[PDB]
């Protein structure tokens, strides 16, 4: 109940990405490398009264035997060494498009993410190059947004003040030359 998200962001270029993947596969787990191809949408709540309000829905594209996932991340709460904010994980069936459209939302921007996923300890680390979709409503034409990739350590824990940030800092140090992780924005 009431889970928190801790996040570290940073980028990695293309050849440095081969190197970084090769390093991270060294220290995540023995499980396997798992690929990662999603398709995200962000639906704005017009909120005639006060303020914008957003939900992001990721639909897998690699499995297709898998459900869609709603996620709402609250405003960034404010020394904690990571970006801390609320995170609600809401897995729903393949209907949420029309459902949210009836609710009163509308699709702002859609981005397809192709990359990799790793999970050491409670922590979860992923790299993924956000492709841009030129045509509204097709995942076939996918241009690169930035020549480089994006990495994110992410941990979802209870609301209780926990030592997640310490493991965050440690695992951030152990990959310092190839990639930089810090709070942002």
């Amino acid at each position: 109940i009431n889970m928190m998200e801790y996040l570290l962001q940073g980028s990695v270029l293309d050849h440095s990405l081969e190197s970084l993947i090769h390093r991270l596969r060294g220290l995540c787990d023995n499980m396997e490398p798992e690929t990662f191809l999603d398709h995200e949408m962000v639906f704005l709540l017009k909120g005639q009264q006060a303020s914008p309000f957003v939900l992001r829905a990721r639909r897998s594209m690699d499995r297709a035997g898998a459900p869609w996932h709603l996620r709402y991340l609250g405003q960034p709460e404010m020394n904690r060494h990571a970006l801390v904010r609320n995170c609600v994980d809401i897995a729903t069936s393949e209907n949420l498009t029309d459902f949210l459209m009836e609710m009163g939302f509308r699709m702002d921007h859609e981005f397809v993410a192709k990359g990799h996923l790793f999970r050491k300890g409670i922590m979860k680390i992923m790299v993924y190059k956000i492709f841009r979709i030129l045509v509204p409503g097709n995942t076939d034409s996918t241009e690169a947004l930035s020549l480089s990739y994006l990495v994110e350590l992410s941990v979802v824990a209870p609301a209780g003040q926990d030592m997640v940030s310490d493991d965050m800092k440690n695992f951030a140090e152990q990959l310092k030359p190839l990639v930089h992780l810090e709070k942002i924005d």
């Binding site: 980028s11 050849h15 440095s16 970084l20 921007h109 981005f111 947004l145 930035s146 942002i184 924005d185």
Partner: peptide, 28 residues
């Protein structure tokens, strides 16, 4: 001694980093 040492191929590129994290954050 001629130190002048310089790391090769900085991998971050922080400006592109800010662009990427901003796209994932707000808009593109």
């Amino acid at each position: 001694e001629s130190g002048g040492l310089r790391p090769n191929k900085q991998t971050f590129n922080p400006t592109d980093t800010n662009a990427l994290v901003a796209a994932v954050a707000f808009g593109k």
